[PDB]
Symmetry: C2
Subunit: 749 residues, 2 copies
């Protein structure tokens, strides 16, 4: 009875005709109230005579709320027609958003709830949804648009079209996006919009997996991607208006389950989540003209406007602030921004940063120009947020960046914990893989059979303690000095990633050792540690007898808790989709190596093709320079006549815009679109560089481009793989930028 509008004929004699429109949220209910009492404007349509509304967004108080209005009995089983004819409504029709959230959450729980208790209602048809168009394309002529209920049904349409300069493509992911014209239009044919769920005897196991525990089988299920619906499946759905449970659950609620765990766990190619990749791409795009200081809320507003960030601002502001912190033992070891201001210190974990009204930010632009090179950002797959081009799917850096900066996730949802690796020990291994004159190039012999002779040990940069390997795990230690005059113990270095004030409180709470120490003061600097622990008198002789001299840990380093264990949970997201757990750090590096050399081969192949057709166009223009006298265009002022004349004298037609600036185009689109254009690389000249003193320029340009094409053709013939000698120069420029940044305190003066 909460937000429930009762139908007129509900519970009476014609209660087998009624529907119960079950909307999620509260704006969907406003759309339904607009559509149901639409009036005399459509006589053949629904109304409140046979439709009632109830809200959702609640085994809770809400799922016991539709039971009270349908008259459902838990003890019944509803097998025959006369036994399920004592319900107060004919069916339920769900009204959810077309986005990742509504069809994953509300429909998924409602179907699982009906399958758990009354599975004979999904059979014979009682749970229905209604689906509203996703994409509408509007012509500049006619008023009735062309509508698509799935995105693949739009991709199969617009691929077969001409230039879409007269069409407006418009996406509708939520029910609050439909205008009054088109919400009036959807309630013309309300009955051609209601689909029915069915069972297929695989839904038993699939409802067992995704809902109701069994986390082992969910971890076995979410390892692969989200395979979208094929063409014959969508045609078979539209033919009979019946959708199976297993297709909707596999496609439309696996995708929610993967969307929820992809904003916590980072991709393993670049080490970023989705929001951090938005921040990096918006920072590359923002600071490209002038590298001027922007404040943090202004750069956050830029990223929200231009990279389509729709999850609040305080998450965005703390992600902008968190990335640019450079204290000892921070999350980023190679930050992508420069923190002009006060971004917090090591003592309370970066939580004492300034307000984002006051602090500023700017790019690194010597690190970020060299780690993520700009001529490979045109070869990466991108995401599309409602038809507009946002951030890429994944960057591929030069050096394996998922194991270089160490960070965890600040939640107890999913397990993820990375400790950094030695830069001097990843560079030796990468340059053993790439270079052929590097004497340890038998790495290939044990990159397959795992026979590993080069090491990867943890970072120990910005760390004055010790790291020791005890059997299987590494341990970090702190340092201390003892004054045997006035018995103050001075703590000078805590172990890795341990903030100071939480350490002080952890000594405060342990009462078995608070009964020895008297007073404790933190006189530390902003980046070093100096803690005085003043002990009670006659204490040092008996704390040795309480806390024993173990070989792994002496008497003081368990008295003051100066030992840390480096547990490491390596759970990552695949590029195509899924979840992968790795179990050593060698495997993350091995996976990274295959992907990067294919970007070297792709961008060299792309450059080779573009140089081919640049040379073709410039040779054609020089040939027009030679015999320009035999073309009296002064009386050929009609464009089609000069076009037909130039078609006779062997000149090729060229799409000159796509030759000058190939913008995110692939190799095959360059091959099949650059030869279909007009003759406006000749018939659009200034007639100012047509003389002799500019022909030498174009002959020299052809000379430079031909030499560069010979250079690219000898780069693609190398050993061990194409583009190898390009990638060593990139490694050297990266490590010079990192070395120039480490001895400037990452300010780059």
């Amino acid at each position: 009875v909460d937000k429930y509008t009762r139908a007129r004929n509900a519970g009476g004699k014609r209660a087998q005709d009624c529907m119960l429109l079950a909307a999620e949220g509260d704006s969907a209910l406003s759309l339904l109230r607009t559509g149901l009492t639409l009036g005399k404007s459509n006589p053949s349509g629904p109304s409140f005579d046979f439709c009632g509304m109830i809200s959702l967004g609640g085994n809770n108080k809400v799922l016991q709320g539709i039971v009270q209005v349908l008259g459902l009995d838990f003890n019944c089983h509803y097998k025959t027609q006369e036994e399920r004819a004592k319900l107060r409504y004919g069916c339920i029709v769900a009204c959810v958003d077309q986005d990742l959230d509504g069809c994953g959450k509300i429909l998924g729980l409602l179907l699982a709830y009906f399958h758990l208790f009354w599975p004979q209602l999904i059979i014979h048809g009682f749970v229905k949804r209604l689906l509203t168009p996703l994409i509408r394309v509007y012509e500049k002529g006619k008023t009735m648009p062309v509508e698509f209920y799935y995105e693949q049904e739009f991709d199969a349409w617009a691929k077969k079209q001409t230039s879409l300069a007269n069409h407006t493509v418009k996406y509708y992911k939520g029910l609050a996006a439909h205008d009054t014209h088109e919400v009036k239009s959807m309630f013309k044919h309300f009955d051609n919009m209601v689909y029915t769920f069915t069972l297929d005897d695989s839904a038993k196991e699939l409802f067992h997996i995704y809902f109701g525990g069994e986390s082992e089988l969910r971890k076995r299920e979410l390892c692969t991607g989200v395979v979208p619906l094929t063409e014959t499946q969508t045609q078979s759905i539209h033919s009979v208006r019946r959708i199976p449970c297993s297709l909707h659950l596999q496609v439309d609620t696996k995708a929610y389950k993967l969307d929820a765990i992809e904003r916590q766990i980072p991709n393993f190619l670049d080490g970023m989540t989705r929001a951090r990749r938005k921040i990096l791409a918006g920072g590359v795009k923002c600071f490209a003209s002038n590298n001027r200081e922007r404040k943090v809320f202004q750069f956050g507003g830029y990223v929200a406007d231009h990279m389509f960030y729709h999850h609040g601002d305080m998450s965005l502001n703390t992600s902008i602030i968190k990335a640019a912190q450079y204290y000892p033992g921070s999350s980023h070891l190679y930050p992508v921004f420069i923190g002009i201001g006060s971004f917090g210190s090591r003592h309370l974990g970066g939580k004492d940063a300034g307000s984002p009204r006051y602090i500023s930010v700017q790019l690194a632009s010597e690190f970020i120009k060299t780690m993520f090179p700009a001529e490979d950002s045109w070869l990466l797959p991108y995401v599309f947020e409602d038809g507009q081009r946002a951030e890429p799917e994944y960057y591929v850096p030069v050096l394996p960046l998922a194991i270089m900066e160490y960070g965890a996730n600040p939640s107890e949802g999913w397990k993820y914990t990375t400790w950094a690796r030695q830069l001097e020990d990843i560079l030796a291994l990468v340059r053993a893989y790439v270079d052929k004159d590097n004497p340890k190039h038998e790495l290939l012999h044990y990159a397959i059979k795992h026979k590993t002779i080069l090491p990867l040990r943890p970072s120990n940069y910005n760390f004055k303690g010790h790291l020791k390997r005890f059997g299987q795990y590494y341990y970090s230690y702190g340092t201390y000095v003892i004054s045997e005059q006035r018995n103050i113990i001075t703590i000078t270095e805590l172990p890795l990633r341990v903030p100071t004030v939480a350490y002080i409180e952890s000594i405060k709470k342990s009462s078995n050792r608070m009964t020895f120490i008297e007073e404790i003061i933190d006189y530390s600097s902003s980046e070093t540690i100096e803690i005085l622990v003043k002990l009670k008198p006659n204490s040092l002789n008996r704390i040795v007898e309480e806390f024993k001299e173990t070989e792994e840990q002496d008497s003081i380093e368990n008295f003051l808790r100066l030992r840390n264990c480096l547990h490491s949970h390596l759970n990552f997201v695949k590029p195509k989709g899924g979840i992968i757990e790795f179990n050593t750090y060698y495997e993350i590096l091995y996976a990274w190596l295959p992907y990067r050399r294919e970007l070297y081969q792709k961008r060299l192949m792309r450059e080779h093709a573009v140089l081919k057709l640049r040379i073709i166009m410039e040779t054609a223009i020089v040939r027009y320079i030679n015999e320009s006298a035999e073309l009296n265009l002064s009386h050929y002022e009609d464009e089609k006549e000069a076009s037909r004349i130039l078609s006779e004298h062997g000149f090729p037609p060229l799409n000159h815009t796509l030759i000058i600036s190939p913008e995110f185009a692939s190799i095959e689109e360059l091959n099949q679109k650059a030869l279909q254009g007009c003759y406006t690389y000749i018939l659009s000249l200034q007639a100012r560089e047509l003389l002799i003193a500019a022909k030498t320029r174009r002959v020299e340009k052809i000379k430079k481009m031909q030499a560069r094409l010979d250079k690219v053709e000898q780069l693609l013939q190398e050993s061990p793989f194409p583009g190898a000698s390009v990638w060593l120069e990139e490694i050297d420029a990266v490590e010079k930028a990192i070395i120039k940044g480490r001895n400037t305190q990452w300010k780059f003066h």
Copy 2:
């Protein structure tokens, strides 16, 4: 003992030398820890030997926390030197932000707390603050900047300068904005930065007013503006490093008290708060090139980036949504945006809007182009957020917009409630004031002596009920029909601004009238009301005997609560600063009328001056066209030589950039800057329009501009005030845009 670092010599024998740096927040404490243990890099500076730190997170647990570390006794009075020499520190030194918040809140409460209990400590000097530069200007040459502690001390500096093309002006409103170089630089001279508070025997009454109740005297105090410090006062403060309590409280904590009540109460010129004025100016700036659709979070990100909005996004998103709702009885009656989507309905108060990920927005551009005309946005005073030009101080519309759209504030902080006024009754009164042939132009005879013959009654648009005046107040009524067959009462119209679902719950809670009715169902449309109240049998004869037939209210309209009283609290903000309460709606209109005609006079005077110097420049160029033959500049290729030659032949030097585009410049800046420039309106020609076929163009342009100057000179000589005939045409275009919008449901097709 909460976040307290004990000074090293505190409480001992040299405890008269120590300081207690009391920082607000937690980033200030990181700055102080960076500065105190700065090391051997300055030997003559503070350290932890004689300085301790304590935080001020917030008569509480924190103000009893500095008592415990200073050793303050409530019963003592601390009059003589030997009685205040038993404290554990020498003084307290406050470290607060230079912004509106820190110096208003934390210093204000700390000074009031010390004045309430130990007033003999402010005398003889115990409460000190620390002053950090506000503005630094950096030269492209030298490295040491020029520093300013007050803003007036910067305005008196930069006014006396030359062109600031080699200086970078940089503002520091918060303590987290100081870089490493300059936080190291401020701790060189730490002792030239600590100022001491003193009493002046007016602070007794001023501490009595602002702190500790007495809201009557605060309402009497905040009626005027915030008069900033004069030059001789700041020089007298810097001479002896003593600041009075009364100057800091009057200037720096009145300003916080006015900043807090200026984001709730709107200005009376335009009817907007500060955030809504940011949204309007950013919407005018965003949708100016192409009036496309932008989603609400993208337009919010634009306003945060370009108009300097620093108060979160959900306040901004709900203000963008409330600025475009157009249901019956909404806040805006003339919304400034067009709501492409679903922005909520009248039934639950417009709080059932869509998510701002999905809904879109665009400008009105026929209303907003005519109410706020674009050639007066260059004559309004603006605000400056850290040296950059944000939103104006106040718009001045055409029609008095504070009394046309009715809205309240959704809080119990300050009283503000406006009910709209009849458009047909404000237009008659404004056009009686402006026009001289309008026969009721004796409005001037009783705009002074208040003798009022034209009325202002409430709106009754989008309202099907009744409005009746009973003595002093207006009352709104609802409608109903009674079926004497099956005793359902059908409610068809609720009174003004009353949402439906809250009305239903208000009938549900009253148990003395729920004992008669038994069902109540809501079959309303999106914009009309239809509620069925199904009563128990034999009920209608006795509800007449419970609820009497008063002349003001019959038996049904107090049974169903269909009567509303129109209380109206008219509290507004002045343009200069302050709080004004008005007590009728005539007075708001009278105040608005004087301001608008001075903008007509200002923009006509501005246009007159610009046309004068445009005619001067174009006449000079035509004179150069005449005798261009007598200037052989072919061997005068040196620019200074041709400049000195053109200075001889009567040609005036003109700043041509400021003549072509006068950008926010006043009349006197046009008069004293347009005559000091170079001769590059002649010596920068294309030499393509120098021939005969372009001289006719410039002679015709001089003809048009001379006719327009005669038109402006006869507009400034009118009656009753200059620019009167310009303002009637604006009223007619406004009311045609409003009439074109009311019968399109404010979609403007």
